[PDB]
């Protein structure tokens, strides 16, 4: 079966390819902003929203990957094939957990309809020719 | 943060830990079951429940992990080291995903309440020493 | 003064002496169960029941015994001369705690009367010669 | 599993520590108190209150500590011992079982509220410069 | 600007100055008292009063000062000079904080009115020469 | 006890770590802007708000620190350990009294809800990757 992480939220993996893969801030910055003012709500015993739910399942699925990145560093004796794994997890796999972490946190902050309009408005700027492309990128705010 | 992926659904991971590793069925059976009787809803653009939502995020997160073991096979060289990683994903985290994949799917066909009532009732079964322990474990009916 | 901790709950110590001392699960399994099902109620500012109160004062009694049971190692220079310290109280005395932790937890999950009828029922089961009756045993559950 | 045995009784462990440790009477005193005014009430088969319940469990928990302080001593002879053993029991948790055995015994004979009103009413009286305070202590009435 | 931290609460610092230095109890007792019977409200996200708000800003500002005397101990070298700073914080500003810490805490357990009525009534006591002065100072009751 | 200066105002010390420590204008600029159009209200005999109250207690607690910075300069004979103190007070301790002074004055100027939204909107810009990070930072205004 072909599940899309963003389908139920009115988005799609298509629409998020609009954003360049070198947008989405670091996983550090994301998780930090999560525990900023959602720390309480995330540890709450009640699913505040479908957004909150996915954010929890994403944060933990990432946590499983940091437990993997540690066990690999302390059980793989060959450091040529040990640092080939601890790189892929913190780089390539981290990208999917950056899009997901951005999307859900941005929604809890600004609103899912505001986010979906941002994804579209960005796809006008990013696809606007460099000559007329305005100096400032569109940024989510209030 | 300290996030229990079961706190939402009236459960805890401590309650889910009592289950022995030989309890949950294979990840292949866990995904064959999911697609067999929830696919239409899982691929749907409707947040059918908090249960469904978390199931998707789990099925996907695991699909991420099988992309890792596919990459490790054809990018990691040392055959004794690439089968140390491939055996960790396939086993140690696999149980964590078998615990979660089972839970959300179970509560979909029996309800969160009937499931939690089981976990408790099973908890007191396995906690009973084998001598006084009833011959067969309690089994989950729709009741 | 002879205070029976089970008296106010419709039972006696003479009764829980019936379930053969190796029937009650391990203290950790007990405590985990208390965390899994009653943690929130145990940290509440409301005396949820006479059961909750006694169990709070019991987990903390053993919380005064871990700490003291289970003690000597960070303060006793002498590692040995404890053949039946040791332990021992964690065997011939730290069994009272397992009885209480079971009784109160079981009653909070199944009901005071349900447990008092199970105390009796299972009591007559094990008291049979290991003979004809039966294969299965009485067990607290949700049938 | 952070359990405060005073929380259900509208108090905290911090508030009991607010009183000086030379305040709560000896355990031999406290145990003689219950058997004096409540012996019938405690050996009673109905939980007269949450206090009666907690106090019964406390007296037995202490009885298990004078059973341990006796069995450490009744094969040994190396130091005392009764050295770093039957002193610690009768020093550190001894204070705790003086604090607890008092609190509950008091509320039965005074009133849950009057007890808490007093714990504060004392506690700070002793924390008051002598030149400007009542001659002797403030003392529980009702 | 000229801000009197007492002008808000119907008082003045001149009225608060009449109190001799031996009057307010120690800063350690002033913080032990605060946490003993206001902590739940002090840590609360509710501006319980203007009194509470100012108390927090004072308890914190003092916690800042004990971070200064902790830093001065292990960063200032000259032992005769680092004990000149440590003695200033612990004494001269400490009295200012004992004046303020006492005031807001006092008005919390007796009301702003009963407190201000005292400060006046005490003001006329201490202002009386010892010969004609009543033997014991007036003491603050809940009245 | 663990008091948070910002908890009651709907904020938290977490949320203010969003802002880089080299934001918050000088203490001079802060106190000057305070006496600009709040001079009257701050010296008023009535607590205009909980914000006004904390601002008063913060300005004075700072004033105590400038009395300390002076007494140190004229009673510490050793100028190696005298200028080690008058630096820490005007630098490290001054930072906490800059966040506090900014936060409360900004609220009295723009509104506590507007400020809390600024702290969030800033935490999007500051955490937005330098490549797409728009030339102008979000600034509080009207
Ligand atoms: C009447 C009757 C039966 O007794 C029969 C036959 C019932 C027993 C429960 N069964 C279903 C079941 C699970 C589930 O929901 O299935 C969709 C789930 C499950 C969930 C997902 C999977 F992939 C596989 C399973 Cl195994 N779990 C369990 C389970 C696990 C351990 C012990 C007993 N039952 N079973 C079938 C009906
Ligand atoms: C719930 C229920 C029930 O009460 C119901 C319905 C069951 C409960 C368990 N019972 C076992 C049983 C006896 C008894 O309920 O002992 C507690 C009694 C018994 C009675 C007195 C004793 F001292 C010991 C026993 Cl062993 N007798 C036997 C027995 C007789 C013949 C062969 C083997 N076992 N078994 C059967 C009934
Ligand atoms: C009846 C009667 C009593 O007379 C008795 C006993 C009352 C006298 C006031 N007492 C309390 C008190 C202060 C306060 O509010 O306590 C929380 C406050 C106080 C406030 C904060 C502290 F940390 C310590 C104190 Cl000390 N101040 C004072 C104080 C200061 C000087 C002279 C007399 N009383 N006392 C107790 C009741």
PDB file of N, CA and C in Angstrom, chain D residues 41-120:
ATOM      1  N   UNK D  41     -10.357   2.038  67.659  1.00  0.00           N
ATOM      2  CA  UNK D  41     -10.669   2.605  66.352  1.00  0.00           C
ATOM      3  C   UNK D  41      -9.773   2.054  65.246  1.00  0.00           C
ATOM      4  N   UNK D  42      -8.574   1.621  65.616  1.00  0.00           N
ATOM      5  CA  UNK D  42      -7.614   1.126  64.636  1.00  0.00           C
ATOM      6  C   UNK D  42      -7.784  -0.366  64.379  1.00  0.00           C
ATOM      7  N   UNK D  43      -8.061  -1.121  65.435  1.00  0.00           N
ATOM      8  CA  UNK D  43      -8.304  -2.550  65.295  1.00  0.00           C
ATOM      9  C   UNK D  43      -9.733  -2.795  64.820  1.00  0.00           C
ATOM     10  N   UNK D  44     -10.463  -1.702  64.607  1.00  0.00           N
ATOM     11  CA  UNK D  44     -11.801  -1.739  64.030  1.00  0.00           C
ATOM     12  C   UNK D  44     -11.773  -2.253  62.591  1.00  0.00           C
ATOM     13  N   UNK D  45     -12.845  -2.939  62.171  1.00  0.00           N
ATOM     14  CA  UNK D  45     -12.929  -3.502  60.818  1.00  0.00           C
ATOM     15  C   UNK D  45     -13.528  -2.573  59.751  1.00  0.00           C
ATOM     16  N   UNK D  46     -13.703  -1.289  60.051  1.00  0.00           N
ATOM     17  CA  UNK D  46     -14.128  -0.333  59.026  1.00  0.00           C
ATOM     18  C   UNK D  46     -13.201   0.876  58.967  1.00  0.00           C
ATOM     19  N   UNK D  47     -12.676   1.148  57.776  1.00  0.00           N
ATOM     20  CA  UNK D  47     -11.837   2.319  57.542  1.00  0.00           C
ATOM     21  C   UNK D  47     -12.579   3.595  57.915  1.00  0.00           C
ATOM     22  N   UNK D  48     -12.449   3.992  59.177  1.00  0.00           N
ATOM     23  CA  UNK D  48     -13.164   5.144  59.721  1.00  0.00           C
ATOM     24  C   UNK D  48     -12.876   6.430  58.954  1.00  0.00           C
ATOM     25  N   UNK D  49     -11.701   6.493  58.339  1.00  0.00           N
ATOM     26  CA  UNK D  49     -11.276   7.671  57.599  1.00  0.00           C
ATOM     27  C   UNK D  49     -10.123   7.273  56.688  1.00  0.00           C
ATOM     28  N   UNK D  50      -9.670   8.193  55.821  1.00  0.00           N
ATOM     29  CA  UNK D  50      -8.406   7.899  55.139  1.00  0.00           C
ATOM     30  C   UNK D  50      -7.229   8.011  56.106  1.00  0.00           C
ATOM     31  N   UNK D  51      -7.422   8.749  57.194  1.00  0.00           N
ATOM     32  CA  UNK D  51      -6.385   8.910  58.206  1.00  0.00           C
ATOM     33  C   UNK D  51      -6.143   7.619  58.968  1.00  0.00           C
ATOM     34  N   UNK D  52      -7.224   7.014  59.452  1.00  0.00           N
ATOM     35  CA  UNK D  52      -7.141   5.745  60.167  1.00  0.00           C
ATOM     36  C   UNK D  52      -6.421   4.703  59.323  1.00  0.00           C
ATOM     37  N   UNK D  53      -6.750   4.667  58.035  1.00  0.00           N
ATOM     38  CA  UNK D  53      -6.137   3.728  57.103  1.00  0.00           C
ATOM     39  C   UNK D  53      -4.635   3.964  56.970  1.00  0.00           C
ATOM     40  N   UNK D  54      -4.258   5.195  56.638  1.00  0.00           N
ATOM     41  CA  UNK D  54      -2.855   5.544  56.444  1.00  0.00           C
ATOM     42  C   UNK D  54      -2.035   5.364  57.719  1.00  0.00           C
ATOM     43  N   UNK D  55      -2.660   5.629  58.863  1.00  0.00           N
ATOM     44  CA  UNK D  55      -1.989   5.513  60.153  1.00  0.00           C
ATOM     45  C   UNK D  55      -1.784   4.053  60.549  1.00  0.00           C
ATOM     46  N   UNK D  56      -2.746   3.204  60.196  1.00  0.00           N
ATOM     47  CA  UNK D  56      -2.623   1.769  60.429  1.00  0.00           C
ATOM     48  C   UNK D  56      -1.471   1.193  59.615  1.00  0.00           C
ATOM     49  N   UNK D  57      -1.410   1.573  58.342  1.00  0.00           N
ATOM     50  CA  UNK D  57      -0.354   1.122  57.443  1.00  0.00           C
ATOM     51  C   UNK D  57       1.010   1.645  57.889  1.00  0.00           C
ATOM     52  N   UNK D  58       1.013   2.813  58.524  1.00  0.00           N
ATOM     53  CA  UNK D  58       2.246   3.434  58.993  1.00  0.00           C
ATOM     54  C   UNK D  58       2.799   2.728  60.226  1.00  0.00           C
ATOM     55  N   UNK D  59       1.911   2.360  61.144  1.00  0.00           N
ATOM     56  CA  UNK D  59       2.303   1.658  62.364  1.00  0.00           C
ATOM     57  C   UNK D  59       2.863   0.275  62.042  1.00  0.00           C
ATOM     58  N   UNK D  60       2.291  -0.366  61.030  1.00  0.00           N
ATOM     59  CA  UNK D  60       2.757  -1.679  60.611  1.00  0.00           C
ATOM     60  C   UNK D  60       4.065  -1.590  59.835  1.00  0.00           C
ATOM     61  N   UNK D  61       4.188  -0.564  59.000  1.00  0.00           N
ATOM     62  CA  UNK D  61       5.421  -0.330  58.257  1.00  0.00           C
ATOM     63  C   UNK D  61       6.574  -0.069  59.219  1.00  0.00           C
ATOM     64  N   UNK D  62       6.273   0.596  60.329  1.00  0.00           N
ATOM     65  CA  UNK D  62       7.268   0.845  61.362  1.00  0.00           C
ATOM     66  C   UNK D  62       7.570  -0.429  62.141  1.00  0.00           C
ATOM     67  N   UNK D  63       6.552  -1.264  62.322  1.00  0.00           N
ATOM     68  CA  UNK D  63       6.724  -2.534  63.002  1.00  0.00           C
ATOM     69  C   UNK D  63       7.635  -3.458  62.219  1.00  0.00           C
ATOM     70  N   UNK D  64       7.633  -3.293  60.900  1.00  0.00           N
ATOM     71  CA  UNK D  64       8.512  -4.060  60.029  1.00  0.00           C
ATOM     72  C   UNK D  64       9.943  -3.537  60.108  1.00  0.00           C
ATOM     73  N   UNK D  65      10.103  -2.325  60.634  1.00  0.00           N
ATOM     74  CA  UNK D  65      11.425  -1.716  60.763  1.00  0.00           C
ATOM     75  C   UNK D  65      12.081  -2.021  62.104  1.00  0.00           C
ATOM     76  N   UNK D  66      11.268  -2.333  63.107  1.00  0.00           N
ATOM     77  CA  UNK D  66      11.798  -2.764  64.394  1.00  0.00           C
ATOM     78  C   UNK D  66      11.988  -4.276  64.382  1.00  0.00           C
ATOM     79  N   UNK D  67      11.470  -4.915  63.337  1.00  0.00           N
ATOM     80  CA  UNK D  67      11.686  -6.337  63.116  1.00  0.00           C
ATOM     81  C   UNK D  67      12.990  -6.528  62.346  1.00  0.00           C
ATOM     82  N   UNK D  68      13.307  -5.566  61.485  1.00  0.00           N
ATOM     83  CA  UNK D  68      14.557  -5.588  60.734  1.00  0.00           C
ATOM     84  C   UNK D  68      15.725  -5.144  61.607  1.00  0.00           C
ATOM     85  N   UNK D  69      15.477  -4.153  62.459  1.00  0.00           N
ATOM     86  CA  UNK D  69      16.500  -3.641  63.365  1.00  0.00           C
ATOM     87  C   UNK D  69      16.858  -4.679  64.421  1.00  0.00           C
ATOM     88  N   UNK D  70      16.017  -5.700  64.539  1.00  0.00           N
ATOM     89  CA  UNK D  70      16.226  -6.765  65.509  1.00  0.00           C
ATOM     90  C   UNK D  70      16.888  -7.986  64.868  1.00  0.00           C
ATOM     91  N   UNK D  71      16.615  -8.222  63.586  1.00  0.00           N
ATOM     92  CA  UNK D  71      17.184  -9.389  62.911  1.00  0.00           C
ATOM     93  C   UNK D  71      18.592  -9.146  62.367  1.00  0.00           C
ATOM     94  N   UNK D  72      18.937  -7.889  62.109  1.00  0.00           N
ATOM     95  CA  UNK D  72      20.318  -7.568  61.779  1.00  0.00           C
ATOM     96  C   UNK D  72      21.156  -7.826  63.021  1.00  0.00           C
ATOM     97  N   UNK D  73      20.627  -7.428  64.170  1.00  0.00           N
ATOM     98  CA  UNK D  73      21.343  -7.571  65.421  1.00  0.00           C
ATOM     99  C   UNK D  73      21.401  -8.978  65.994  1.00  0.00           C
ATOM    100  N   UNK D  74      20.487  -9.853  65.580  1.00  0.00           N
ATOM    101  CA  UNK D  74      20.363 -11.166  66.224  1.00  0.00           C
ATOM    102  C   UNK D  74      21.000 -12.357  65.498  1.00  0.00           C
ATOM    103  N   UNK D  75      22.149 -12.117  64.876  1.00  0.00           N
ATOM    104  CA  UNK D  75      23.103 -13.174  64.555  1.00  0.00           C
ATOM    105  C   UNK D  75      24.475 -12.537  64.559  1.00  0.00           C
ATOM    106  N   UNK D  76      24.500 -11.217  64.405  1.00  0.00           N
ATOM    107  CA  UNK D  76      25.753 -10.484  64.253  1.00  0.00           C
ATOM    108  C   UNK D  76      26.362 -10.047  65.581  1.00  0.00           C
ATOM    109  N   UNK D  77      27.507  -9.376  65.496  1.00  0.00           N
ATOM    110  CA  UNK D  77      28.212  -8.890  66.677  1.00  0.00           C
ATOM    111  C   UNK D  77      29.508  -8.187  66.283  1.00  0.00           C
ATOM    112  N   UNK D  78      29.765  -8.114  64.980  1.00  0.00           N
ATOM    113  CA  UNK D  78      30.968  -7.469  64.468  1.00  0.00           C
ATOM    114  C   UNK D  78      31.160  -6.087  65.083  1.00  0.00           C
ATOM    115  N   UNK D  79      30.251  -5.103  64.656  1.00  0.00           N
ATOM    116  CA  UNK D  79      30.459  -3.801  65.306  1.00  0.00           C
ATOM    117  C   UNK D  79      29.515  -3.636  66.489  1.00  0.00           C
ATOM    118  N   UNK D  80      28.214  -3.679  66.221  1.00  0.00           N
ATOM    119  CA  UNK D  80      27.211  -3.637  67.285  1.00  0.00           C
ATOM    120  C   UNK D  80      25.952  -4.518  67.088  1.00  0.00           C
ATOM    121  N   UNK D  81      25.163  -4.367  66.015  1.00  0.00           N
ATOM    122  CA  UNK D  81      25.308  -3.385  64.939  1.00  0.00           C
ATOM    123  C   UNK D  81      23.940  -3.127  64.301  1.00  0.00           C
ATOM    124  N   UNK D  82      23.162  -2.130  64.745  1.00  0.00           N
ATOM    125  CA  UNK D  82      23.406  -1.218  65.878  1.00  0.00           C
ATOM    126  C   UNK D  82      24.635  -0.304  65.769  1.00  0.00           C
ATOM    127  N   UNK D  83      25.133  -0.138  64.548  1.00  0.00           N
ATOM    128  CA  UNK D  83      26.271   0.732  64.283  1.00  0.00           C
ATOM    129  C   UNK D  83      25.884   1.738  63.209  1.00  0.00           C
ATOM    130  N   UNK D  84      25.853   1.263  61.971  1.00  0.00           N
ATOM    131  CA  UNK D  84      25.392   2.053  60.842  1.00  0.00           C
ATOM    132  C   UNK D  84      24.082   1.427  60.386  1.00  0.00           C
ATOM    133  N   UNK D  85      23.415   0.765  61.327  1.00  0.00           N
ATOM    134  CA  UNK D  85      22.233  -0.038  61.037  1.00  0.00           C
ATOM    135  C   UNK D  85      21.029   0.379  61.880  1.00  0.00           C
ATOM    136  N   UNK D  86      21.042  -0.007  63.155  1.00  0.00           N
ATOM    137  CA  UNK D  86      19.940   0.285  64.071  1.00  0.00           C
ATOM    138  C   UNK D  86      20.117   1.691  64.659  1.00  0.00           C
ATOM    139  N   UNK D  87      20.845   2.526  63.926  1.00  0.00           N
ATOM    140  CA  UNK D  87      20.943   3.941  64.241  1.00  0.00           C
ATOM    141  C   UNK D  87      20.270   4.717  63.120  1.00  0.00           C
ATOM    142  N   UNK D  88      20.636   4.388  61.883  1.00  0.00           N
ATOM    143  CA  UNK D  88      20.038   4.996  60.696  1.00  0.00           C
ATOM    144  C   UNK D  88      18.525   4.800  60.666  1.00  0.00           C
ATOM    145  N   UNK D  89      18.082   3.613  61.069  1.00  0.00           N
ATOM    146  CA  UNK D  89      16.658   3.311  61.151  1.00  0.00           C
ATOM    147  C   UNK D  89      15.988   4.212  62.184  1.00  0.00           C
ATOM    148  N   UNK D  90      16.765   4.455  63.222  1.00  0.00           N
ATOM    149  CA  UNK D  90      16.331   5.239  64.323  1.00  0.00           C
ATOM    150  C   UNK D  90      17.054   6.540  64.279  1.00  0.00           C
ATOM    151  N   UNK D  91      17.083   7.113  63.108  1.00  0.00           N
ATOM    152  CA  UNK D  91      17.555   8.486  62.920  1.00  0.00           C
ATOM    153  C   UNK D  91      16.898   9.211  61.749  1.00  0.00           C
ATOM    154  N   UNK D  92      16.975   8.616  60.563  1.00  0.00           N
ATOM    155  CA  UNK D  92      16.587   9.309  59.337  1.00  0.00           C
ATOM    156  C   UNK D  92      15.160   9.037  58.868  1.00  0.00           C
ATOM    157  N   UNK D  93      14.796   7.765  58.769  1.00  0.00           N
ATOM    158  CA  UNK D  93      13.410   7.415  58.499  1.00  0.00           C
ATOM    159  C   UNK D  93      12.642   7.426  59.808  1.00  0.00           C
ATOM    160  N   UNK D  94      13.387   7.396  60.909  1.00  0.00           N
ATOM    161  CA  UNK D  94      12.805   7.544  62.228  1.00  0.00           C
ATOM    162  C   UNK D  94      12.126   8.893  62.360  1.00  0.00           C
ATOM    163  N   UNK D  95      12.785   9.933  61.853  1.00  0.00           N
ATOM    164  CA  UNK D  95      12.203  11.269  61.805  1.00  0.00           C
ATOM    165  C   UNK D  95      10.949  11.271  60.942  1.00  0.00           C
ATOM    166  N   UNK D  96      11.021  10.577  59.810  1.00  0.00           N
ATOM    167  CA  UNK D  96       9.893  10.485  58.890  1.00  0.00           C
ATOM    168  C   UNK D  96       8.697   9.791  59.534  1.00  0.00           C
ATOM    169  N   UNK D  97       8.964   8.733  60.294  1.00  0.00           N
ATOM    170  CA  UNK D  97       7.903   8.015  60.993  1.00  0.00           C
ATOM    171  C   UNK D  97       7.488   8.719  62.280  1.00  0.00           C
ATOM    172  N   UNK D  98       8.185   9.796  62.625  1.00  0.00           N
ATOM    173  CA  UNK D  98       7.748  10.659  63.716  1.00  0.00           C
ATOM    174  C   UNK D  98       6.871  11.756  63.140  1.00  0.00           C
ATOM    175  N   UNK D  99       7.264  12.253  61.971  1.00  0.00           N
ATOM    176  CA  UNK D  99       6.487  13.252  61.248  1.00  0.00           C
ATOM    177  C   UNK D  99       5.130  12.690  60.838  1.00  0.00           C
ATOM    178  N   UNK D 100       5.145  11.525  60.198  1.00  0.00           N
ATOM    179  CA  UNK D 100       3.916  10.912  59.706  1.00  0.00           C
ATOM    180  C   UNK D 100       3.010  10.428  60.834  1.00  0.00           C
ATOM    181  N   UNK D 101       3.564   9.643  61.756  1.00  0.00           N
ATOM    182  CA  UNK D 101       2.783   9.122  62.877  1.00  0.00           C
ATOM    183  C   UNK D 101       2.176  10.238  63.710  1.00  0.00           C
ATOM    184  N   UNK D 102       2.830  11.394  63.726  1.00  0.00           N
ATOM    185  CA  UNK D 102       2.257  12.548  64.400  1.00  0.00           C
ATOM    186  C   UNK D 102       1.074  13.102  63.623  1.00  0.00           C
ATOM    187  N   UNK D 103       1.356  13.560  62.406  1.00  0.00           N
ATOM    188  CA  UNK D 103       0.392  14.231  61.536  1.00  0.00           C
ATOM    189  C   UNK D 103      -0.994  13.598  61.543  1.00  0.00           C
ATOM    190  N   UNK D 104      -1.050  12.298  61.268  1.00  0.00           N
ATOM    191  CA  UNK D 104      -2.318  11.577  61.224  1.00  0.00           C
ATOM    192  C   UNK D 104      -2.979  11.470  62.597  1.00  0.00           C
ATOM    193  N   UNK D 105      -2.181  11.165  63.617  1.00  0.00           N
ATOM    194  CA  UNK D 105      -2.681  11.067  64.987  1.00  0.00           C
ATOM    195  C   UNK D 105      -3.265  12.403  65.450  1.00  0.00           C
ATOM    196  N   UNK D 106      -2.715  13.492  64.922  1.00  0.00           N
ATOM    197  CA  UNK D 106      -3.153  14.835  65.280  1.00  0.00           C
ATOM    198  C   UNK D 106      -4.496  15.173  64.645  1.00  0.00           C
ATOM    199  N   UNK D 107      -4.590  14.967  63.334  1.00  0.00           N
ATOM    200  CA  UNK D 107      -5.791  15.307  62.577  1.00  0.00           C
ATOM    201  C   UNK D 107      -7.032  14.591  63.102  1.00  0.00           C
ATOM    202  N   UNK D 108      -6.836  13.396  63.651  1.00  0.00           N
ATOM    203  CA  UNK D 108      -7.925  12.653  64.269  1.00  0.00           C
ATOM    204  C   UNK D 108      -8.415  13.354  65.530  1.00  0.00           C
ATOM    205  N   UNK D 109      -7.486  13.976  66.248  1.00  0.00           N
ATOM    206  CA  UNK D 109      -7.784  14.559  67.551  1.00  0.00           C
ATOM    207  C   UNK D 109      -7.925  16.076  67.482  1.00  0.00           C
ATOM    208  N   UNK D 110      -7.868  16.635  66.280  1.00  0.00           N
ATOM    209  CA  UNK D 110      -7.841  18.088  66.158  1.00  0.00           C
ATOM    210  C   UNK D 110      -8.595  18.646  64.963  1.00  0.00           C
ATOM    211  N   UNK D 111      -8.505  17.955  63.836  1.00  0.00           N
ATOM    212  CA  UNK D 111      -9.131  18.431  62.622  1.00  0.00           C
ATOM    213  C   UNK D 111      -8.108  18.698  61.539  1.00  0.00           C
ATOM    214  N   UNK D 112      -8.266  17.985  60.427  1.00  0.00           N
ATOM    215  CA  UNK D 112      -7.444  18.123  59.227  1.00  0.00           C
ATOM    216  C   UNK D 112      -7.007  19.554  58.930  1.00  0.00           C
ATOM    217  N   UNK D 113      -7.957  20.478  59.014  1.00  0.00           N
ATOM    218  CA  UNK D 113      -7.688  21.878  58.726  1.00  0.00           C
ATOM    219  C   UNK D 113      -6.911  22.570  59.839  1.00  0.00           C
ATOM    220  N   UNK D 114      -7.322  22.343  61.083  1.00  0.00           N
ATOM    221  CA  UNK D 114      -6.681  22.985  62.228  1.00  0.00           C
ATOM    222  C   UNK D 114      -5.209  22.592  62.320  1.00  0.00           C
ATOM    223  N   UNK D 115      -4.906  21.362  61.917  1.00  0.00           N
ATOM    224  CA  UNK D 115      -3.532  20.870  61.893  1.00  0.00           C
ATOM    225  C   UNK D 115      -2.672  21.663  60.907  1.00  0.00           C
ATOM    226  N   UNK D 116      -3.188  21.848  59.696  1.00  0.00           N
ATOM    227  CA  UNK D 116      -2.460  22.566  58.654  1.00  0.00           C
ATOM    228  C   UNK D 116      -2.343  24.056  58.961  1.00  0.00           C
ATOM    229  N   UNK D 117      -3.374  24.613  59.589  1.00  0.00           N
ATOM    230  CA  UNK D 117      -3.348  26.007  60.011  1.00  0.00           C
ATOM    231  C   UNK D 117      -2.265  26.219  61.058  1.00  0.00           C
ATOM    232  N   UNK D 118      -1.979  25.170  61.821  1.00  0.00           N
ATOM    233  CA  UNK D 118      -1.025  25.247  62.917  1.00  0.00           C
ATOM    234  C   UNK D 118       0.408  25.030  62.455  1.00  0.00           C
ATOM    235  N   UNK D 119       0.593  24.054  61.570  1.00  0.00           N
ATOM    236  CA  UNK D 119       1.904  23.747  61.006  1.00  0.00           C
ATOM    237  C   UNK D 119       2.575  25.005  60.470  1.00  0.00           C
ATOM    238  N   UNK D 120       1.780  25.851  59.827  1.00  0.00           N
ATOM    239  CA  UNK D 120       2.246  27.155  59.383  1.00  0.00           C
ATOM    240  C   UNK D 120       2.372  28.100  60.572  1.00  0.00           C
TER     241      UNK D 120
END
